[model samples]
Target: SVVEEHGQLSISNGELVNERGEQVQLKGMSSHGLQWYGQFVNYESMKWLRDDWGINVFRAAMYTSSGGYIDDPSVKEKVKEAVEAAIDLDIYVIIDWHILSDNDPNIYKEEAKDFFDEMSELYGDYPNVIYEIANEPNGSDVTWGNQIKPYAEEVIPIIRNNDPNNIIIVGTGTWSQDVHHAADNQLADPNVMYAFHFYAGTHGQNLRDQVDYALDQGAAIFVSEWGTSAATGDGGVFLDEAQVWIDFMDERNLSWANWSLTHKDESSAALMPGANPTGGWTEAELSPSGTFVREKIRESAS
Candidate 1:
């Protein structure tokens, strides 16, 4: 399994390196907002993705708004279930404090702190656990220095106090596409990485150029969430552009988790609508993006 092979992951010289100091790329899936797609996060589904799709990581996207954790704290249970499944499967899991509609992370600063504090205390020791502090920091007012960085600065220590070794990923400005901002003023922590997300149909070379600039500045990057559809998540899949992004990641050794693994009727969804939530998915049950991502993962393994 990936965990046995990589042992633990750390950022070194702006790359995700393994225990042996070798660069490692973690290809995987991200669950849609846990509150909406909670049924698909069970162990069996994750196991199937690991064994069949060649995924090495899984992200539990726990949205902070949209009737999520803030509205019902019980959503944490689904996150724990996903973490347990990843631990059992010997694959890495990212506990994402998904912040989309809640544009500025500062709005939920205290909640995020408590959440990370508890999560770090509970799963800090496990090498398979990684914490994504913010999903996507948006809004014109949500600058990296003023909002996202300060929010990360406050919440990161809470996690580090309990778990110092695991990697923490922070979102950049403009819905996590402004990696250059994060690269310019990076966190002092050595293990932290910046998140960069894109929708192939909507984002192109302009976004890739930003990522390239961030990399040149020696900032570690992780594509925590990217879609083949437009940013709205409803357009058709854009395979050609997605392949370009895939090639870029392959060349750079950047780790990524495709957004997402749900049966929701969206182009980004890996599963067909009404697909079984507990794995055992036939090829017929996979969407076109799913087929493309699965093949890409398999090819990477080879």
Candidate 2:
């Protein structure tokens, strides 16, 4: 199993390294906002993904808006369920504080602090857990220097206070595309990485170039979320462009999770509408993007 083999993950020389200091790239799925797709996060589904789909990691995207955690704090129970499932399955899980609709993270700083403080305290001893403090910091005013970096500097310590060794991922500027800004002015923590997001139809070589520059400047990166469709999640799947990105990430050894694992009628969604929620999914139940991602994960599994 991934957790048994890797034990714990940390950053080293601009790469994600396991306990043995070997470079490791985690491949897996990200759930759509837990508020909507919480049913798919159960242990049976996660074990199926691990045993069949060859996913070594899972990301629980707990959205802060769009009727999510902020709208109802009880949604956090889904995140707890995901962590427990990952622990039982012996795979890695990222407790993602998915902040999309909320532009600046500072607006909900207190809530985020309380959330991480509680989460880190609960899962501090588990090696399968990782923390993604912010999902995507957008808005022209939400620059890295002023908003994103400062917010991370504040929230990271809260997690570190409880769980010292787990890797922390902080979102970059411009919906996590502006990695250069973060690379130039990175946080002082050794185990922290920057987040990068992309959509095959919407993002191309230009975004890759930005990543290249950030890597050259010694920034460890994690593609916490990406899609095979357009950024809006409804365009046609761009397999060709997705292949290009696959090659790029493979060459760079970047860890990533596919955009979603829900039955939502979106091109990026892995499952078709009315698909079974408890993990007995057939080929017919998988969307085109899901099929492609599953094949890639199986092919790349160590």
Candidate 3:
């Protein structure tokens, strides 16, 4: 409905605005690594999220390692299918270059360059597509200015060249906790935002404080990925803390996508292990985290 009601989306004064210049916050589900759950990216699953679950957006995490982009480039075709489906359905879709294990965006700069170039060229004319340049930059080695920024500097141009007006999401360092650092050195572009990811069980006060600092510093923020479980995606579910973060996002008009819309046997997955890729899952079919996230998403409707 956001896509049809709003048409085109933009960011102004740190808020995601629709084509009519009205502020809008997107709430949706993000797929796990495409390599592992390619079957779930089909049209039936997306339709379920949009028509049944009140989802207005979707994200496809195209990982770079661990049998991902570098391991096999063919996986990108599956990602393309999802984007195409989103375009037809009028829902916002994020093409995520998931770089968690690599810990840096520069590791595959050339491939990233080529990937964005081809993707932008393919879907540049569509208004519903968003590009998340990097997923999560972890460890002490990565920083906004030196490592991540430079990688974005190269990749952004490739995307802008073809898809000049679409929103671009960049990840912060320290597993996306360093939004404060990124806020200090904001990107020199329009319609771009910094990504802040948090698993409520692991990242609570410290990261939220950083988020507050970033907002104070005028950083356009978007939670491209987060979960109710611990940061590991498999531990314990903290529904209460996750609700706190959701309230904060709602108050600030920040858009968010819950981590993993899969049936993977992990703490963060929204579906149970026996989930059918075509969706139509009932309450009993969802995992604990999945059950909570579904209700949270539907709650945002009113």
Clashes of each: 0, 0, 0
lDDT assessment of candidate 1? 0.93
Score every model by TM-score: 0.98, 0.98, 0.97
Clashing pairs in model 2? Answer: none
**What does each candidate score in C-alpha RMSD?**
0.9, 0.8, 1.2
TM-score of 2: 0.98
Clashing pairs for model 3 are none
Runs in model 2 deviating more than 4 A are 232-235
RMSD of 1: 0.9
**Tens-place lDDT digits, model 2, residues 160-225:** 999988999999889999999999998999999999999998999899999999999999999999
Pitting candidate 2 against candidate 3, the one with the higher TM-score is 2
